[PDB]
Amino acid sequence: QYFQFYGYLSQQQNMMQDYVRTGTYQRAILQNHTDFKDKIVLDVGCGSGILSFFAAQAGARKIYAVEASTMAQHAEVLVKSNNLTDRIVVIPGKVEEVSLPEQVDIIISEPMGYMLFNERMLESYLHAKKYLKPSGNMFPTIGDVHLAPFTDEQLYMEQFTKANFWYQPSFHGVDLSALRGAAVDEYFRQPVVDTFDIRILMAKSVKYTVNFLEAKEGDLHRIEIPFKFHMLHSGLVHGLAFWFDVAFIGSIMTVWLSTAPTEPLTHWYQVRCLFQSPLFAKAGDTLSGTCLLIANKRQSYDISIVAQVDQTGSKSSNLLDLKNPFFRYT
Amino acid sequence: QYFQFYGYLSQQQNMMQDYVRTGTYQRAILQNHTDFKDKIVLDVGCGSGILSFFAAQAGARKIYAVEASTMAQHAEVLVKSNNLTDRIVVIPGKVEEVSLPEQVDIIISEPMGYMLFNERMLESYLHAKKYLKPSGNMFPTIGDVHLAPFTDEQLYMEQFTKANFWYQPSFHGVDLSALRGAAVDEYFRQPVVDTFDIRILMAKSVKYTVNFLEAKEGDLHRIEIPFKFHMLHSGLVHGLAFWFDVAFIGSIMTVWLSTAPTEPLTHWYQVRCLFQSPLFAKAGDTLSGTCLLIANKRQSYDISIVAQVDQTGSKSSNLLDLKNPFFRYT
Amino acid sequence: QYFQFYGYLSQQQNMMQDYVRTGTYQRAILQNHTDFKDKIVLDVGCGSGILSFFAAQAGARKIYAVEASTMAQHAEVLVKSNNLTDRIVVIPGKVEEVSLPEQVDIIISEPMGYMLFNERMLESYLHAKKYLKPSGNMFPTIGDVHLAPFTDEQLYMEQFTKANFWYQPSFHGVDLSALRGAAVDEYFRQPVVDTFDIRILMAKSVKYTVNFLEAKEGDLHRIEIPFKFHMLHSGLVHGLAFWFDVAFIGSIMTVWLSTAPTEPLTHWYQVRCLFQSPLFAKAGDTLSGTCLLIANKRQSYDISIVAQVDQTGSKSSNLLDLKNPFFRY
Amino acid sequence: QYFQFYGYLSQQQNMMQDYVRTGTYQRAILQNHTDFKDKIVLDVGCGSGILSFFAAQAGARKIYAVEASTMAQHAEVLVKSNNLTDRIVVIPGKVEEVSLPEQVDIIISEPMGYMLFNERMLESYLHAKKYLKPSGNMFPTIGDVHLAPFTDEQLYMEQFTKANFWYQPSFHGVDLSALRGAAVDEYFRQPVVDTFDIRILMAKSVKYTVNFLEAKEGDLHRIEIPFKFHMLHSGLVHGLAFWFDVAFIGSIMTVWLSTAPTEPLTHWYQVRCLFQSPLFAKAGDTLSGTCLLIANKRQSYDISIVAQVDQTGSKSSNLLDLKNPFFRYT
Amino acid sequence: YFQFYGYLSQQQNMMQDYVRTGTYQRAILQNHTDFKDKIVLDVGCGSGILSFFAAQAGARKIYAVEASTMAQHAEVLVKSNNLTDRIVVIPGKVEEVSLPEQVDIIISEPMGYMLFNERMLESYLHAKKYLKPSGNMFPTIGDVHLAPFTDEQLYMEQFTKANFWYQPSFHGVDLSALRGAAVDEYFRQPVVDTFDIRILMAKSVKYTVNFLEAKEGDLHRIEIPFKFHMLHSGLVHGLAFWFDVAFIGSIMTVWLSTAPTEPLTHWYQVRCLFQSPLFAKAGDTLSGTCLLIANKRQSYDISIVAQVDQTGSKSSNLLDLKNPFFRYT
Amino acid sequence: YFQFYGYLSQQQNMMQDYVRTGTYQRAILQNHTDFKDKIVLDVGCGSGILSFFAAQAGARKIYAVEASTMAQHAEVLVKSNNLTDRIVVIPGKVEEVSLPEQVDIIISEPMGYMLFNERMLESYLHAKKYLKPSGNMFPTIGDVHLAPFTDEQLYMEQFTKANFWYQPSFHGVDLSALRGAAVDEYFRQPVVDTFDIRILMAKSVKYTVNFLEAKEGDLHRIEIPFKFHMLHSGLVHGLAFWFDVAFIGSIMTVWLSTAPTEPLTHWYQVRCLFQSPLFAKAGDTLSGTCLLIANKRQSYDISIVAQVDQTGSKSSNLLDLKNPFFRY
Ligand SMILES: Nc1ncnc2c1ncn2[C@@H]1O[C@H](C[C@H](CC[C@H](N)C(=O)NCCc2ccc(O)cc2)CNCc2ccccc2)[C@@H](O)[C@H]1O
């Protein structure tokens, strides 16, 4: 069901129209030509092949382009029509289940999901290091998740407006009221995907770093992100906002791709997890806690956020379902 | 304070734009020309004087046009510009307080309000019979208020949609939830003024008649309307719908002005009093009870509607303030 | 995985907002009170349980409300909070797998999908007849699929315009052109879910009836619909439009729920399947061919349409995937 | 019986949906926490109590929340349900008549009406300084009215289109013409409440400041606003536009709430006073005069505007009734 | 006028009056002996439709005359329908062209608004120079009807529109001085639309023209006296006009009526408003004259003078039939 | 021809374009030193609105020429606004009357659909025989803009609307022989209405007429070359037209635009279809010419020809601007 989605050219078209992402990848690869020139490359989850073509443009000798959806057939068509069949080898299948005839010098991929970790494609990316030669590189090389507390009364009250549909005593004779709390909980469990004005942020971001050269596939099963924010503004904290940056650390240039709200919009937007019970904070208070991601059987994570205002002892605890994201952007 | 808003020509313009009303009054008067020809007329609440002009067109000898608001000054200007100062005498003040130099053959007025009785102007109209000669007439002569049970899921649910604004636990940090019930109650206490399709009615209307020629002021202080509806459709009864007809019973013809939902729309629309607890009825059931209007000090009535489905014993008891209608029409 | 979608109250809220559908069902049930009064009822795929509450309003003795998704848990909460545990028993699971304690007098459901047959829920509905007493009834009792030829130059050309991205000869140094034909093919294979003005229909519709009391589950594995349209307007025929009507044939009255473009809009909208290549026809001409639906493993059908103008003999076909509809509304 | 309509939760809900207003008040209070922390506070015309709740969020020891309408009963319910009985005391009645057992450190209120002064609530706000310590503050602290000449052909001509309803010689046989000029005068006497594009303003605004810490209740009975505009565009001046800003001058930050047409729209919109006789001005001309506001018994003001182009001597004098605004925004 | 008639989009619009076309067909077909083997002149044939009806009734020769370039399209239609032996299209004005042969019957649709507009009836009468002794004419006679009406909404509309000019500063310009002239202009326009018969205040009066007897010159000055017996009281806002024609064949008489009690035609009905309305009591008498004088622009200058005999109130009105207001929507 | 302009109802309708009226008033009032104590000529004044604006800017004297019986209403307005000294109404066509004084500036609204319809620009230019060598014209220049568009619905309507003519037995008559001619007729109608800018497939090309420099005879034959760089792939169904004018004063230049990106005016925009649509890919070039030849009926015969340069594919049409189709 995950991979069927990706078999449609309508879907590929949509994915290729992120010009920030595509330009940044092309630059990371082309400006680090000595990391590709005459090298063996693995492209994990190539779709229609775009990153593999960039690797070929940078002079790679062979690129193994692995794709688990029927999009592999279309990649094969483009490889031939662009006269690169000697240089890009399309491999249908999951990177966990295919065979490479050869170890590689560098792995390239776009494994980032919403909040960095959605899709659990980072685990596939890390799994693929079994094909990596000693002292081989990975593009992207490291990933930083950023989180910061926000206030947004409008977003917060939206959840109740929607749930209150159920708070009526005679819907064609039926009293729906008993489901209102369940509706509220469900909406608050959905991470909210859209952008926002940076003015809603109440403290400087905290980060959590994954070095993909060092990290092990298993490490991503249980991710514990601690935080201690020093509040720069007084107000109601309605949740945490998330974005991420990744770096392509080449031998010539380090290139960054950012999905920060201070940067041009990408197809990852930003993500906000709401607290059903908001926390009041004054300037100078400290908002501490932990965000815990546990991998689930649906290409996703269960999210647990507990935060407290240290100076008052008010706590808020929040469970979210990263497999039911709410796409709010317009 | 009550008559202030009637002093404005913008408001007079709006009232004159009901062409169903204006045209029906003109027909009733002109077609009953022998009821006006060389007679003395009293116009109760003449506004800018339009009904008095109609009486004049039908050949009245003299018309005393009584007006409580500053609109009286504007009527006097129209009378003069229409070269009728000899035949229409504008008397500023309440019909209960002014003096007429003589008795009249016929009284004409537009005393009907929402649900017929709102404004308590019917009492002013009846009071004015102290000026009426024996066997004089009144136009309108009788009025029939009709009530029928309706179903309307959208209108009913709208009340909770609006009250649920208060059902939120952190409106800028404030828990508003405790006011939800009071907000619901307030909305249901407002009779709804708008129109509707006749297919929402669930039984044939019951009526209650006032003969303006025989009735006295005292009969309008406590208005008791029993009802027994034979339900023609099964479903949820959300309230009673109200409209009214008046007849101008002249010597030549009887002309009706109807505000029913089967008839062209007037500025009275129709009125619906909702039940906060709807009643389930099957076709063939009997919905019985009492609509009781008690006159109050704000030119209106305290409404009490008590209804029950006889076969099931489910009951609904409802209090409404006709002083504060919700104008819903768009 | 399929049923996970249905477990969300947001989705249920969206579904409940089809007031044409809900009001018609309530009417069908309440006006046919003798088909429910003191009867045993099966509600197939009850969601939050609304149809079951209607059967209870009509006086049913006992209603078994079967729901495959976790929405069953919410249905249960509503039955308890509405003081109806006496009369409605919620059974979590598919209707094909659960056990009921007794046979029933009437089955009620909303098994219709896009183009009537999508979801293959009609099969689950027919399957539920193993619980039905002899001379028991079903609500809906019959369903008619309707098809008619349409002209819509905007819709047809969109299929190519949407593929324009693929013409790029240098998308960051990559020629995408070789995939443009495939993008176009893919788009043409999507049935189009939206509504339209009836002025685009070039002939009175042809129908196909499924009688839910007579039909067997297996009859819906291969559905063959022939047509011969008599054209009432001249023009280009870009494809076939589909909608459906169901009838609740009660002892007291027959109530119809229609999704025709002449009736108020429902959450099923209407569906249009394009021909690869449009066909010209003049008023008075006839258009004939067949529509074949074959059930697949993804809760849907492969649709084959072949049609021709009888006079000129212009031929067009298409093979569409009802599992990948385009929601154009 | 001015306060009747404020006792309705439906009215309170409408008022509470001005999010610019609510957010700006909360920010002003929370960022100036030291002006509230452990202090005594008076809230004048608290309605449902929202500002009192913000003052409690900022750490106030005791808040006296005064409210003249039956909304006072609903505030008391919110105080109980938000667990603040020990800190917020609701006092039903007019601030001019109630007893307070204690002097206060700060007064908070939303006394502003259309054109700043409508409602005459500013007088009540100033009246309440009898409770304010000499060291105390008021939120808001100052208010600035801004006025500027505008051109708007469509607005100007609409008044005549409306009045021309009366310019007809046989409305069911009646010549209505003699009322046309009175209708025109009536429409021009109504200040227009709605918004507009700033491109209609023909000169930079002039302002008139009221310092709520300095002013006396009595200074608001007669308000004389002199103006002199240096015209920046040639054209016809159809009247004066008005808006207002208030500043909350805290010991920590000064926060502004603006109702300017360059700013996000509030429930005060902007107000335009039309000239029945427009004034022609060239760029570089000076348009001078006075706007005089005289308080009246209807909780409003009689407005007099006298304007001249200094270079040509072309004059315009206009009288308006702020008690009868026309709400044009749709 | 003839430029306008040259367009096929205009022809299409003209041909879509089904009441008119059907009635002309029944008149011609049902009087088949009036046509069977006869010589026909068709005055102003357009694309030729009436000539085709005459052929269908078995006429031997039909001379179809048309002044616009639509005559070229009529020629095409005749050839394509293989009727060149029996229908001869002659391009030009019937006044000026040549016919080889005298004819048994003339057919035409010479009726305009209020019957007389276009003055095409003078071309129809002029054509009789080609008519044999004992020849016929379809239509044979025409009746115009007039009746007083009351319509507050229509009346007041004229002032609402004219009151645009009643303002003292339209971008600095006082427009007021033109309000009276605008009012007069609107009241000079006959109003083309339909209405409910309940607005009529007296039984109609009629004026008849016998096309067999009448000469071209009889229509330069048309004087229509009237005396109405007012059946209802109210304000008389003007006169409503309509017409009937009869086709008097030897087998049957067929009527085409444009009355407000009859199915709508493309002529609708016409109302001439009175700027000063007249108050009438039931039983009063409204008398006066409607006078039509021919003008250079294919039309008439209209004068209506009316008074209520019992009160002496008079209303005098001038109208321009060359600038009708098409109000029908 | 001018008869329909004689009616106040038609003048009311024209006065309701507030974008037009406001822009002209701004042009004039902001350039007050161009009018102050000057002599002005107003070509086709109608009820006289622009002449009043020149008066507001302080003009000494304004000659307002009007060819229809609207001239009588203008003189009424002039007199009622107490301006009979300053504004002189001259009934007649400006080409058929003499004026008593040279002028410092000519004001007019000579633009028609596609800028040129009505041929009133020739009248505007003709009036330059009274303009002093140093004088100005308001508007001073006019740019007609064209761009290729895609609109399959508009294309198909030309055929659909002719379906009436297919019928082989309309009351026993076969109409089929006329359907072709019916289609050709609809095709020759330029289409007046508005549309979404998203239908445009390339950036516009312009053709400028400078009113200070042009001669009347220059407008008898107008050739407009174009080369479009296509920004989108797909079918080109025709060319869209609109126009801008500039009032180039000594103080400010004010533009009045009828573009589909601007608020709608009573000129709307105009579209002319090709008989057959052309396919082009993004990056292709679409080149051709629009040729306008003035005709006897105050209009133009329009010839449009286009080709895709990379493929040699061609279409064209010949349109009649005297018979536009008002679609809006
Ligand atoms: N002297 C007084 N003493 C006590 N109690 C008073 C006094 N004067 C006014 N009270 C009360 O005070 C309240 C009005 C407060 C202020 C209303 C404010 N001036 C406003 O929005 N004016 C524009 C809307 C409008 C109003 C009237 C009108 O004719 C036209 C337009 C509400 N503040 C607190 C607040 C803040 C945010 C959200 C909601 C509320 C009412 O409840 C009055 O009963």
Numbering used by the authors:
A (entry chain C), B (entry chain B), D (entry chain A): 148 to 477
C (entry chain D): 148 to 476
E (entry chain E): 149 to 477
F (entry chain F): 149 to 476
Extract from the study:
Protein arginine methyltransferases (PRMTs) act on their substrates to yield three different forms of methylated arginine: asymmetric dimethylarginine (ADMA), symmetric dimethylarginine (SDMA), and monomethylarginine (MMA), which are the terminal products of Type I, II and III PRMTs, respectively. Among the important Type I PRMTs is CARM1 (PRMT4), which regulates multiple aspects of transcription by methylating diverse targets including RNAPII, SRC3, C/EBPβ, PAX3/7, SOX2/9, RUNX1, Notch1, p300, CBP, p/CIP, Med12, and BAF155. The requirement of CARM1 is implicated in multiple cancers, with its methyltransferase activity particularly addicted by hematopoietic malignancies and metastatic breast cancer. Mechanistically, CARM1 methylates Arg1064 of BAF155 and thus facilitates the recruitment of the BAF155-containing SWI/SNF complex to a specific subset of gene loci that are essential for breast cancer metastasis.
The SAM analogs 2a and 5a were thus characterized as SAM-competitive, substrate-noncompetitive inhibitors of CARM1. The overall topology of the CARM1–5a complex is indistinguishable with the V-shaped subunit of the CARM1 dimer in complex with SNF and 1 (details in the next section), which is typical of the Rossmann fold of Class I methyltransferases. However, 5a adopts a noncanonical pose with its 6′-N-benzyl moiety in a binding pocket that used to be occupied by the α-amino carboxylate moiety of canonical ligands such as SAH, SNF and 1, while the α-amino methoxyphenethyl amide moiety of 5a protrudes into the substrate-binding pocket. This noncanonical mode is consistent with the SAM-competitive character of 5a. The α-amino amide moiety of 5a also engages CARM1 through the combined outcomes of a hydrogen-bond network and hydrophobic interactions with nearby resides. Interestingly, the overlaid structures of CARM1 in complex with 5a and a substrate peptide implicate a steric clash and thus a potential for binding competition between 5a and a CARM1 substrate. However, the apparent substrate-noncompetitive character of 5a suggests that this steric clash might be avoided if there is no significant energy penalty when the substrate Arg adopts alternative conformation(s). The distinct modes of interaction of CARM1 with 2a and 5a also rationalize the CARM1 selectivity of the two SAM analogs over other methyltransferases, including closely related PRMT homologs.
